[PDB]
């Protein structure tokens, strides 16, 4: 996250870190046994780390649970990043508490102008590299479809939306991928892509989660 703020320990209780020896992507806990992340975050050998603040210190609220199965969306396209979403099942159910909690799935899509909370352990510089140890947060609005398509001609599908600031300075970034965009208490987006980070006229592009709720529910029901 570029141009955000330190969230506070365990204030984003659905935020997960995907670990393969090191943090490499975010995710969102959606029930005791399932995490939603970005398909471009796929790899084998994932350990899900719940209850994190400092990803480099054991602080006492963590739960570390191996993935038993990963499911990339059937129509994910890694060239266009259309359908950039994946489900991870945990080998065991998380113990849910005030600091490890699921985030509600949307029943309706969000609209341009709605404020949202975006979070992660990604890069904090736009012309630089600096990775934080504690979780960073950004409040950002959803942008109109037309301004999104105008910023990124020929690239925005119906499964994407833009959020952030066209002036630049405030965005998600490398290492935030897969993590949450939560608006009025609902998981509306997944950190997906963008040209650089926090560049003028290049807002963040996010997977439109409301399009996938039927897929998520039926997948969970059969797995
Ligand atoms: Ca920790």
Curated annotation (Swiss-Prot):
Which family is annotated?
Belongs to the peptidase S1 family.
Q: Which PANTHER family match?
A: RIKEN CDNA 2210010C04 GENE, TRYPSIN-RELATED
Record note on modification:
Subsequent cleavage after Lys-125 leads to alpha-trypsin. Further cleavage after Lys-170 yields pseudotrypsin. A cleavage may also occur after Arg-99.
Q: What is this protein called?
A: Serine protease 1
Q: Which residues bind Ca(2+)?
A: 52, 54, 57, 62
Q: Which SUPFAM superfamilies match?
A: Trypsin-like serine proteases
The species this protein belongs to is: Bos taurus (Bovine)
Cite the record's note on assembly.
Interacts with SERPINA1.
CDD domains found in the cross-reference section:
Tryp_SPc
Expression sites by tissue: Synthesized in the acinar cells of the pancreas.
Q: Where is the Peptidase S1 domain?
A: 1-221
Which cysteines pair up through disulfides? They are: 7-137, 25-41, 109-210, 116-183, 148-162, 173-197
Which SMART domains does the record cross-reference, listed alphabetically? Tryp_SPc (SM00020)
Its top-level enzyme class, in one word, is hydrolase
- Catalytic positions? 40, 84, 177
Instruction: Name the residues that bind substrate.
Output: 171-172, 174-175, 177
User: Which gene name belongs to this protein?
Assistant: PRSS1
Carries keyword Nuclease?
Answer: no
A single MF term (Gene Ontology): serpin family protein binding
